[PDB]
Amino acid sequence: HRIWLMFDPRRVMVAMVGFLAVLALVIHFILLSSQRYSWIENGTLSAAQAPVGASAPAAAAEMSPLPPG
Amino acid sequence: HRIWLMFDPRRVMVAMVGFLAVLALVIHFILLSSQRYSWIENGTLSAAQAPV
Amino acid sequence: MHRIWLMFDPRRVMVAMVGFLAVLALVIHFILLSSQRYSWIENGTLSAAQAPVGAS
Amino acid sequence: HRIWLMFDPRRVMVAMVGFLAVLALVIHFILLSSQRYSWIENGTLSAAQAPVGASA
Amino acid sequence: HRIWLMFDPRRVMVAMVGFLAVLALVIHFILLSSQRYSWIENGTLSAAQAPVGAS
Amino acid sequence: MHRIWLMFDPRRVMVAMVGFLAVLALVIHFILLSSQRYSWIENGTLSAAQAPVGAS
Amino acid sequence: HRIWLMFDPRRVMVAMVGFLAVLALVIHFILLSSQRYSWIENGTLSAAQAPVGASA
Amino acid sequence: AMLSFEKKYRVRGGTLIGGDLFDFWFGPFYVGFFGVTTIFFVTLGTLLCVWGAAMGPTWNLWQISIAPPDLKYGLGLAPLREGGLWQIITLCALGAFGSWALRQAEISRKLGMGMHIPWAYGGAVLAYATLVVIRPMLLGAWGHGFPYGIFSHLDWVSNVGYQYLHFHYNPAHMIAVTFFFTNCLALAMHGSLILSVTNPKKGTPVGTSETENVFFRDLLGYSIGAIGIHRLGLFLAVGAAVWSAICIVISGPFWTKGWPEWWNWWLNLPI
Amino acid sequence: MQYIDGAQIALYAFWLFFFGLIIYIRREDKREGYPLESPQGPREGWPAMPEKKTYIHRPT
Amino acid sequence: MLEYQNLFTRVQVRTVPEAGIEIDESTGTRYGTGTFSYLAGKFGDAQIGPIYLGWAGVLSLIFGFMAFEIIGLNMWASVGWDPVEFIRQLPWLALEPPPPQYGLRVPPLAQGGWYLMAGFFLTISILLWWVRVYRRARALNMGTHLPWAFASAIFLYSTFFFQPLLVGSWSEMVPFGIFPHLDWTSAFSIRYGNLYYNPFHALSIAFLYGSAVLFAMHGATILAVARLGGEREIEQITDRGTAAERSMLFWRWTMGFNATMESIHRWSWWFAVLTTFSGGIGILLTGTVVDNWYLWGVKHGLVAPYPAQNTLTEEQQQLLRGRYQGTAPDSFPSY
Amino acid sequence: GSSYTVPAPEHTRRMRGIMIQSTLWSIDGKRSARERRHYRPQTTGAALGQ
Amino acid sequence: MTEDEARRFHGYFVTGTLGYIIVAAVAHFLAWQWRPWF
Amino acid sequence: MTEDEARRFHGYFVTGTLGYIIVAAVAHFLAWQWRPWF
Amino acid sequence: MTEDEARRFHGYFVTGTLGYIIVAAVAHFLAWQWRPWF
Amino acid sequence: MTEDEARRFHGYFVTGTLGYIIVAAVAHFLAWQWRPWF
Amino acid sequence: MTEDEARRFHGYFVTGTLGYIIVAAVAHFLAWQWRPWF
Amino acid sequence: MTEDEARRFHGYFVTGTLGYIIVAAVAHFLAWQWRPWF
Ligand SMILES: CCCCCCCCCCCCCC(=O)OC[C@H](COP(=O)(O)OCC(O)COP(=O)(O)OC[C@@H](COC(=O)CCCCCCCCCCCCC)OC(=O)CCCCCCCCCCCCC)OC(=O)CCCCCCCCCCCCC
Ligand SMILES: CCCCCCCCCCCCCC(=O)OC[C@H](COP(=O)(O)OCC(O)COP(=O)(O)OC[C@@H](COC(=O)CCCCCCCCCCCCC)OC(=O)CCCCCCCCCCCCC)OC(=O)CCCCCCCCCCCCC
Ligand code: BCL
Ligand SMILES: CC[C@H]1c2cc3[nH]c4c(c3C)C(=O)[C@H](C(=O)OC)c4c3nc(cc4[nH]c(cc(n2)[C@@H]1C)c(C(C)=O)c4C)[C@@H](C)[C@@H]3CCC(=O)OC/C=C(\C)CCC[C@H](C)CCC[C@H](C)CCCC(C)C
Ligand SMILES: COC(C)(C)C/C=C/C(C)=C/C=C/C(C=O)=C/C=C/C(C)=C/C=C/C=C(C)/C=C/C=C(\C)CC/C=C(C)/C=C/C=C(\C)C(=O)O
Ligand SMILES: COC(C)(C)C/C=C/C(C)=C/C=C/C(C=O)=C/C=C/C(C)=C/C=C/C=C(C)/C=C/C=C(\C)CC/C=C(C)/C=C/C=C(\C)C(=O)O
Ligand SMILES: COC(C)(C)C/C=C/C(C)=C/C=C/C(C=O)=C/C=C/C(C)=C/C=C/C=C(C)/C=C/C=C(\C)CC/C=C(C)/C=C/C=C(\C)C(=O)O
Ligand SMILES: COC(C)(C)C/C=C/C(C)=C/C=C/C(C=O)=C/C=C/C(C)=C/C=C/C=C(C)/C=C/C=C(\C)CC/C=C(C)/C=C/C=C(\C)C(=O)O
Ligand SMILES: COC(C)(C)C/C=C/C(C)=C/C=C/C(C=O)=C/C=C/C(C)=C/C=C/C=C(C)/C=C/C=C(\C)CC/C=C(C)/C=C/C=C(\C)C(=O)O
Ligand SMILES: COC(C)(C)C/C=C/C(C)=C/C=C/C(C=O)=C/C=C/C(C)=C/C=C/C=C(C)/C=C/C=C(\C)CC/C=C(C)/C=C/C=C(\C)C(=O)O
Ligand SMILES: COC(C)(C)C/C=C/C(C)=C/C=C/C(C)=C/C=C/C(C)=C/C=C\C=C(C)\C=C\C=C(C)\C=C\C=C(C)\C=C\CC(C)(C)OC
Ligand SMILES: [Fe+3]
């Protein structure tokens, strides 16, 4: 197609792959930080037991000491 | 079509793709940060149970 | 009145015009979004009677 | 009409549009920052119900 | 007159308009920051109800 | 399919791919290490029923 | 295997050895910083007495 | 001992004070009238610093502290026990710093050079003079100066910084920090650039001035000149000291409250 | 041990590295104008002047 | 009147813009043709020339713009999407790290998840930029001094990741914000007992001041011999002229010792690098080896004595005892 | 605390900066900003009858 | 850029500008029905 | 650049300034009836 | 660019914009059924 | 690049793009079976 | 590099890629027996 | 640089790599006997 005459395929491929990489990493990271889709910790739960409606801007306490490491 | 003689199609389409990508990211972010449309957590709720 | 396009370059005017219009549209949209009355993402389903009004 | 011989119209037009646009935004933003003319929130109030500043 | 021989009129006009524009903004903004002449808020008050400095 | 190597130098692609895979492997291993369920260095001896599970 | 015709063996050996040495130091340091495998202090404990992570 | 090309440059003339009496070299050093004045003030000031150490509780290098007088003495010459020794040392330091600058001007005059080095050094002297002379005078006591001790003068900086509850919010301090950070970044870039051309990839010839300009245009889209980088380095380093002098001289003499509260003006713009 | 701690060990390692670096840079400083000329003869400070360094120029 | 101080350029030349030395263009190319700035030519070179873009540059720009977008959008959401408040309060806005009780586990999205994601993207962007700098240097057959000078700053930057991980909490990370990262700087110094007594912190201070001193000295020296041709340092290095000789002699007569036209750049390089290297070591030792730098300084004889400003009785010693800070109250009690 | 209860949105700060109350709010008196400081109360469409 | 080209561009610019404002007027009409601001 | 073509410019500039001011006069009259500031 | 090339490019650009907008329209109708914003 | 070279690249690019989207659609089907988001 | 050289490299590359993916498949199956994530 | 040089180096690289992995495997076997991690 004539689009590859206007845009060099070498140049477009790097931008396209980089955009896909950033987008895939963003989505996987967003799901990891959510309560419903934190699959590394709660992936074994069934659909009924998974969290629902947990926006909760102050879901956790903000001020506390560090865990006993 | 005569607009393509006045403006370079290559630079126009690059600026168009870049502008739309940022706009789509900004809108999806605003909805995610809201209470009514935080679809990652709220998505399974019906319209009656959604926050207002 | 078409003679202004010889005084000013049409290509530069269109770019400057579109840039100013895009920025203005975003500012107005976000001014309304942050207001109590016109949030419309949270309170868009409220009727005009139920929409917030500033204190007298 | 002889001012345009002494002053270049191209830069005068740019400076006039630039100054008027900035001045309009400043006045609109000053009113939006006030209580009486915060029209996004209280625009539906009548003149009697609009806020008035502190008196003596 | 002969002042325009000693000074360029174009340079004088720009400096004068720039000075007047700055002075008008400074005066308008000083009055806006005051209490008696905060006209955007208290402009509908009559002269007797306007704020006055103490003593 | 093999003509991709005419468009892209295999030396550059292989070096970039190894760098991408090494970073990806380190990131995934580190994310599992920092979690509660898969912090295998400390709790790797626990059975599947004993391993931590996120709250319902 | 003709990989060495397109990749210089000298640069490969230096990068590979440097990667292995840094990786070995990181793994040894991660174990030393842990509770179960702090072998300098608790290396004489048997497998039964070694620390285990929290069980759920 | 002299460099292999040094003999033909060792000529008379260029001094600001004195003639052939003070136009000689002691070893590698050039001794002028201001070389003699420097040694006098350095010796007097250092000996009084040693005496201040002997008066104090310890000989530990990090813990030696010669402190300024109390604020109640108010621009007078306090007793030498009570801070007067600090004031005498301050005079010796001022005389030595001034003599060092004037000695540098004599050397550049003899070599047919510009006067940039003495004036660049004057930026550091101005910052020191602000700390112990200008700001204490504006505040009305010599006791507002900092003590002379390796870690004692760090305690002064900490307590003075916290006199305004958050010294990071000082607008002039913010600018001065940016000058210091940008100078360090620019120096690393300049040092790398010269070394990379002069010591290139092994087996390749030494690069040219085009190579520098092409490289920084490829990386950043702009390449400052060979003279531009040296102008910029002088501006960044000296401007860091000048903005430092401004930032400390406005704290107390002009602003007395906390520095976070200063940003009211930005929050109360009419718009 | 008790008095010896990690920060002190790291500080002294840095001191050794700094002194070595200063020796190297002082060696590099003596690549022009050396050896020094004195009535008593040739003179070199510590560190001694290094070997002659030759550059490479592009062909004409 | 005064001599020409070589501070500005009055007469500027114009020619065809320098396209650039031929380089490999298989995985990248040069964009633009090269323009001239009249204002920039007064201070330095006038050409706003073409810029090279390749794989690493494009990827770095994409990742860095993603991080910048995340930071800015969280900042904008923190004021309720008000543009006036967004501009007005911009220095005070922040993207805050996770809460302390999560340790190294993944935080909620609105309570530190965005922070970690933006930090990850910024780190990837910085590493890709380092790769781009290395490739740009080796495409022109230059030495790799700038890549390692950049790696030193990257090391200091990465200590802000490694120290929180070594102490065991992402809450200890630096927030993304103009005033908030200064707040973090102050609170980090306070928490660990007066970072002035960190020896590597003092070492980094010494190298920062030394960098300023060295650049002032070198700039003044080169500008003082610029009328003799001293600004052409490569020529004075490969073929020593009278400008290099006069610089050497000035500093030898002033100080008793001198450098060469080449080794003064080694001095500069090492001072600038050692700044961030010693700083990174000092940050790494804080909270992991030493928890109170003032007490470490007292241990190793760094703290000067002062007369006591107060004394406390035994009952005062028991009463003035406090409590370590804990959790915030999650209830509003009724009395 | 041995347990955590989630506060109402109107009691939750939009800004998560620790020092925001003493460095900015102690000097800021704008009513619009003071309103933006916290999240707004929410309900459901069923609760409103919609 | 000759006079005839300025004539051709002006015709499209004026029509586009007036068409854009009319669409924005309809948008404000819809917003007024939903939530009036006066 | 000359008097003849400057006179043609002045006619469009003056009519544009008059039109801008007239719309601002209508805007201020609308704002006064809605919420007077004196 | 030539006029014959501008005609041929305009066809694919208009069809590309047309399809993108139609996909957006279907997406908005899907979101409206799930959770209306008015 | 010739027109024929652009034609050959386009065929592989289109097949690779569409195939990648289909694989992603199957992944979304598997995720939906596990934990639906609507 | 010729077209024949590209063919020869591609054969080794797909075999190395396939061998890498297969060994990773064994690693993922080993981890599933030890501690399943679903 | 040449085909024969590549073959000679490859023979030592393969034996060195494989022998190193076997020695690391024995080290993991000894570590398992001391303190197993699964
Ligand atoms: C980091 C690694 C590297 C770390 C190190 C980095 C080093 C950097 C610098 C590199 C060079 C160093 C070597 C150097 O400077 O050598 C100079 C000299 C050779 O000089 P020269 O070439 O022979 O001299 C040439 C020329 O001057 C000939 O003139 P003439 O021979 O007539 O000399 C006349 C001078 C000398 O007469 C004196 O009386 C001066 C004595 C100075 C030393 C003693 C001080 C105490 C007594 C003071 C006098 C008492 C009455 C007589 O007369 C002058 O006037 C010359 C100028 C003097 C200064 C200006 C006037 C000041 C007046 C006010 C102040 C007075 C004193 C308070 O050689 C030596 O001295 C040999 C030893 C060199 C190594 C240093 C040894 C130090 C030992 C003590 C260490 C103490 C550590 C705390
Ligand atoms: C954590 C991340 C932080 C942050 C990240 C830190 C990363 C590491 C940074 C290390 C310092 C780099 C300094 C520098 O200028 O780098 C640019 C240079 C560019 O070189 P190039 O582009 O490849 O090619 C240019 C080259 O042709 C000329 O380079 P230049 O002359 O400018 O400087 C390179 C060398 C000087 O070269 C020579 O001297 C070669 C001359 C011919 C041979 C000499 C005679 C034969 C000697 C044989 C016995 C000697 C054989 C070696 O300069 C340096 O490498 C720096 C020297 C000063 C620093 C060391 C001073 C002593 C320190 C120890 C003191 C101990 C106590 C007394 O890049 C290089 O890699 C240079 C070569 C570095 C060699 C040492 C590598 C040490 C690695 C240590 C860790 C290894 C893993 C455990
Ligand atoms: C109350 C405050 C504390 C204090 C707390 C700290 C803390 C905490 C730290 C320092 C550190 C430093 N301090 Mg201290 N400091 C105090 C008092 C001082 C005083 C003084 C006048 O008394 C001085 C001169 C200094 C000076 C210094 C520097 C020497 C040093 C930082 C080096 C540097 O270059 O950093 C700037 C350089 C970097 C940050 C390098 C990394 C740069 C990266 C690569 C840039 C990427 C940019 C990216 C591409 C663009 C932006 C992207 C957007 C974000 C999206 N401090 C007091 C005691 N200071 C640091 C240090 O090393 O301490 C040991 C440090 O962390
Ligand atoms: C010797 C130590 C000093 C040092 C050295 C140093 N820094 C370096 C180098 C070196 C040797 C480089 O080679 C490298 C470089 O290329 O410099 C030009 C770099 C560099 N040092 C940098 C910064 C920097 N250095 C600092 C400090 C220091 N650098 C130390 C003092 C600091 C401080 C004081 O905090 C900063 C902020 C960069 C300029 C550069 C590394 C560039 C990089 O990694 O970029 C990654 C890319 C991105 C994050 C993408 C950003 C995208 C935009 C933010 C969005 C644009 C949107 C829109 C188009 C415009 C919006 C405008 C607004 C953003 C204004
Ligand atoms: C609190 O709220 C705050 C915000 C503070 C309150 C403040 C409010 C303020 C200050 C508002 C200001 C508003 C404003 C300012 O005046 C608004 C002004 C708006 C205007 C005028 C918009 C004009 C838009 C014009 C458009 C879209 C034209 C499109 C034309 C097209 C598409 C034709 C394309 C051309 C072709 C095809 C030619 C072919 C080539 C040819 C023929 C060739 O070959 O030549
Ligand atoms: C507290 O509140 C604070 C804020 C502080 C209080 C404030 C105080 C202050 C200081 C207020 C100041 C107000 C002010 C100052 O004077 C205001 C001044 C306003 C003015 C002057 C407005 C003038 C506007 C005129 C316009 C827009 C004209 C446009 C003309 C057009 C479009 C036509 C051009 C087209 C042509 C010609 C085509 C022909 C070409 C031809 C023939 C060719 O091509 O040849
Ligand atoms: C709170 O604020 C908030 C909530 C954010 C509110 C926000 C509000 C705002 C301000 C929204 C703005 C919306 C907007 C406008 O402004 C939105 C504008 C949208 C637009 C215009 C989209 C148009 C997209 C067009 C596309 C995708 C076209 C693709 C074309 C293709 C693929 C063909 C490629 C060409 C080929 C193949 C030719 C081959 C070559 C040939 C033949 C050759 O070489 O010859
Ligand atoms: C908060 O939530 C947030 C996250 C914000 C919500 C998100 C919202 C947003 C905005 C999402 C955006 C999605 C998006 C954007 O458009 C998605 C767009 C995705 C796209 C377009 C994907 C396209 C992929 C294409 C691929 C894989 C093609 C591969 C091609 C191959 C393999 C063939 C090449 C090989 C050749 C040619 C060899 C022959 C060579 C030959 C013959 C030779 O060389 O000769
Ligand atoms: C935790 O949550 C988060 C992390 C956020 C979740 C997110 C996860 C994401 C997004 C993951 C992405 C994964 C991914 C992306 O697509 C993964 C893609 C992986 C791929 C494609 C891997 C490919 C590997 C290929 C290899 C190893 C090939 C080796 C070939 C060799 C050795 C050939 C040697 C022979 C030669 C050279 C011949 C000699 C030369 C000869 C003969 C000659 O020249 O003649
Ligand atoms: C929780 O922890 C975290 C870290 C988070 C978890 C993560 C872990 C991760 C990601 C690990 C990754 C591991 C990995 C892969 O990536 C590991 C890869 C390892 C590999 C491949 C090692 C290869 C070693 C090869 C060696 C030693 C070869 C030596 C060669 C020799 C001895 C021969 C030399 C002699 C010669 C040449 C003779 C001269 C010939 C001459 C002169 C002639 O020929 O003429
Ligand atoms: C309309 O405007 C929009 C929104 C579109 C764009 C505007 C944006 C604006 C205005 C943005 C403003 C940005 C500002 C002002 C930014 C300020 C930044 C500052 C001052 C930053 C200072 C310091 C920050 C530091 C030192 C941060 C360091 C962070 C690090 C090292 C983080 C590392 C994180 C890693 C490696 C994470 C890894 C992830 C995993 C999961 C692997 O580990 C947790
Ligand atoms: Fe230089």
Side-chain angles (χ1 to χ4, degrees), chain N residues 1 4 6 8-9 12-14 18 22 28-29 35 38:
Chain N
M1 227 189 194
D4 70 332
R8 200 241 326 281
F9 175 85
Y12 295 98
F13 181 82
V14 161
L18 195 266
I22 283 174
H28 280 76
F29 201 82
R35 203 169 286 171
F38 291 130

Side-chain angles (χ1 to χ4, degrees), chain A residues 16 19 23, chain B residues 24 28 32, chain F residues 3-4 7, chain O residues 8-9 12 17 20:
Chain A
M16 187 210 47
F19 170 77
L23 179 61
Chain B
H28 276 95
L32 203 51
Chain F
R3 221 158 296 110
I4 196 96
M7 188 171 288
Chain O
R8 194 184 332 109
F9 177 86
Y12 281 118
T17 292
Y20 168 85

Side-chain angles (χ1 to χ4, degrees), chain I residues 44-57:
Chain I
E44 290 166 47
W46 174 250
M49 143 183 51
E51 329 155 329
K52 184 47 68 65
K53 185 186 173 179
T54 34
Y55 291 123
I56 290 174
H57 314 72

Side-chain angles (χ1 to χ4, degrees), chain H residues 1-6 8-11 25 28-30 57-58 60 62-65 100 103-105 107-108 110-118 120 151-152 154-158 162 166 168-169 174 180-181 183-184 186-202 204-238 260 263 266-268 271, chain J residues 3-9 18 20-21 23 30 40 42-52 84 87-89 91-92 129 132-133 136-138 140-146 149 179-180 182-183 185-186 189-190 194 196-197 202 208-209 211-212 214-228 231 233-234 237-238 240 242 245-256 258 261-262 265-266 268-269 271-272 275 300-306:
Chain H
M2 282 179 332
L3 299 171
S4 51
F5 52 81
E6 181 163 358
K8 71 169 155 283
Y9 292 90
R10 277 185 179 204
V11 304
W25 281 258
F29 304 92
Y30 168 75
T58 184
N60 198 300
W62 320 117
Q63 306 173 43
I64 283 150
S65 164
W100 191 266
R103 186 178 157 259
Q104 275 182 326
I107 290 168
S108 40
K110 183 180 300 281
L111 276 163
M113 269 162 63
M115 296 288 126
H116 304 78
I117 297 144
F151 280 91
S152 209
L154 295 213
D155 298 342
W156 179 90
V157 170
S158 181
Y162 279 113
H166 214 145
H168 276 138
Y169 286 68
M174 272 153 45
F180 267 105
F181 283 168
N183 176 86
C184 195
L187 182 78
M189 292 211 282
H190 177 52
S192 305
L193 189 269
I194 294 290
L195 290 185
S196 79
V197 162
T198 288
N199 310 274
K201 185 172 202 336
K202 271 127 172 142
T204 76
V206 156
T208 71
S209 48
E210 283 107 343
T211 312
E212 328 158 311
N213 296 131
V214 166
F215 167 79
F216 267 115
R217 268 181 228 118
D218 274 347
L219 191 60
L220 303 162
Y222 174 69
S223 181
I224 215 162
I227 194 94
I229 181 54
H230 293 97
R231 294 173 179 178
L232 174 80
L234 192 55
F235 167 71
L236 287 171
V238 176
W263 294 90
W266 169 263
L267 294 167
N268 303 346
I271 42 163
Chain J
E3 328 95 278
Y4 176 53
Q5 307 302 310
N6 231 306
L7 284 198
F8 301 102
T9 292
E18 171 58 89
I21 284 133
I23 46 156
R30 285 189 173 119
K42 295 181 175 305
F43 205 76
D45 178 358
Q47 189 177 301
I48 316 298
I51 185 164
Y52 181 94
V84 181
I87 302 328
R88 177 172 102 110
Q89 298 174 29
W92 291 271
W129 192 261
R132 151 186 180 80
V133 170
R136 285 316 93 225
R138 288 271 191 241
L140 290 165
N141 293 298
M142 287 156 120
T144 44
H145 302 70
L146 195 66
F179 285 154
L182 302 191
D183 294 347
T185 313
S186 266
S189 160
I190 289 169
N194 196 13
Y196 276 129
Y197 286 96
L208 194 57
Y209 301 150
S211 285
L214 264 179
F215 218 171
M217 284 174 51
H218 191 49
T221 305
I222 291 304
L223 285 209
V225 303
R227 64 230 212 169
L228 296 148
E231 77 277 73
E233 285 154 311
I234 287 141
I237 279 160
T238 60
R240 168 207 81 223
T242 208
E245 288 177 358
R246 283 165 207 230
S247 307
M248 281 165 108
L249 280 195
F250 178 96
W251 284 113
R252 169 172 209 80
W253 296 350
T254 302
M255 257 192 321
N258 59 277
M261 190 63 85
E262 192 196 338
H265 301 99
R266 297 188 187 281
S268 320
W269 197 88
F271 264 55
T275 303
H300 297 267
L302 264 64
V303 171
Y306 299 140

Side-chain angles (χ1 to χ4, degrees), chain J residues 5-330:
Chain J
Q5 307 302 310
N6 231 306
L7 284 198
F8 301 102
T9 292
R10 177 70 259 185
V11 181
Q12 304 173 40
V13 202
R14 289 289 180 273
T15 186
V16 86
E18 171 58 89
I21 284 133
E22 52 289 332
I23 46 156
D24 183 18
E25 298 244 343
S26 70
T27 87
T29 202
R30 285 189 173 119
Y31 289 89
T33 36
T35 36
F36 290 115
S37 200
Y38 183 66
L39 270 201
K42 295 181 175 305
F43 205 76
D45 178 358
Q47 189 177 301
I48 316 298
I51 185 164
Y52 181 94
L53 257 190
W55 290 12
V58 164
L59 296 178
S60 176
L61 287 181
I62 291 165
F63 276 83
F65 185 71
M66 189 76 244
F68 181 82
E69 271 311 294
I70 286 166
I71 293 153
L73 283 166
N74 271 272
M75 260 171 215
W76 205 352
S78 95
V79 282
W81 299 114
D82 201 334
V84 181
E85 293 320 311
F86 185 41
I87 302 328
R88 177 172 102 110
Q89 298 174 29
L90 198 273
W92 291 271
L93 309 182
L95 177 46
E96 198 65 39
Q101 87 259 17
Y102 276 91
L104 307 169
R105 304 139 46 211
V106 192
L109 191 62
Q111 279 184 287
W114 287 121
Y115 177 85
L116 289 184
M117 189 182 336
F120 174 83
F121 287 134
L122 187 64
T123 309
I124 297 291
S125 185
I126 284 159
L127 297 178
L128 282 162
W129 192 261
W130 185 92
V131 168
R132 151 186 180 80
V133 170
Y134 196 100
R135 302 264 197 194
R136 285 316 93 225
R138 288 271 191 241
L140 290 165
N141 293 298
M142 287 156 120
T144 44
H145 302 70
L146 195 66
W148 300 121
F150 188 27
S152 192
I154 291 176
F155 167 71
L156 176 56
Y157 162 85
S158 81
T159 60
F160 304 135
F161 172 81
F162 281 118
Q163 195 268 350
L165 153 69
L166 284 170
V167 304
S169 208
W170 303 131
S171 48
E172 315 305 276
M173 295 185 96
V174 191
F176 291 112
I178 291 157
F179 285 154
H181 92 295
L182 302 191
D183 294 347
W184 174 96
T185 313
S186 266
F188 181 98
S189 160
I190 289 169
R191 156 77 182 87
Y192 291 116
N194 196 13
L195 205 71
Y196 276 129
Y197 286 96
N198 194 333
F200 287 90
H201 174 76
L203 268 198
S204 64
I205 306 327
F207 286 125
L208 194 57
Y209 301 150
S211 285
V213 173
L214 264 179
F215 218 171
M217 284 174 51
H218 191 49
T221 305
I222 291 304
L223 285 209
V225 303
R227 64 230 212 169
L228 296 148
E231 77 277 73
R232 306 205 288 278
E233 285 154 311
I234 287 141
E235 271 314 311
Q236 308 273 350
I237 279 160
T238 60
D239 194 30
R240 168 207 81 223
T242 208
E245 288 177 358
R246 283 165 207 230
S247 307
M248 281 165 108
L249 280 195
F250 178 96
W251 284 113
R252 169 172 209 80
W253 296 350
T254 302
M255 257 192 321
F257 71 104
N258 59 277
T260 59
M261 190 63 85
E262 192 196 338
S263 58
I264 180 65
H265 301 99
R266 297 188 187 281
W267 279 101
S268 320
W269 197 88
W270 274 109
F271 264 55
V273 159
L274 285 181
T275 303
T276 45
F277 184 61
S278 50
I281 290 147
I283 287 309
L284 272 186
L285 300 162
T286 304
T288 59
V289 177
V290 168
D291 220 52
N292 190 319
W293 281 111
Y294 167 85
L295 278 186
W296 184 93
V298 161
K299 179 179 176 176
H300 297 267
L302 264 64
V303 171
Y306 299 140
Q309 308 294 307
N310 205 12
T311 326
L312 314 169
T313 84
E314 265 266 308
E315 49 92 5
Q316 268 190 331
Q317 284 160 65
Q318 195 75 228
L319 150 65
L320 289 193
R321 186 186 38 41
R323 196 174 294 271
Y324 273 122
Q325 212 193 300
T327 50
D330 65 28

Side-chain angles (χ1 to χ4, degrees), chain D residues 2-25:
Chain D
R2 301 178 190 177
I3 311 77
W4 310 125
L5 311 145
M6 162 142 192
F7 282 99
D8 176 31
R10 201 280 217 181
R11 277 153 82 260
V12 162
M13 272 318 78
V14 152
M16 209 198 42
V17 168
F19 169 80
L20 289 177
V22 166
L23 185 55
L25 284 164

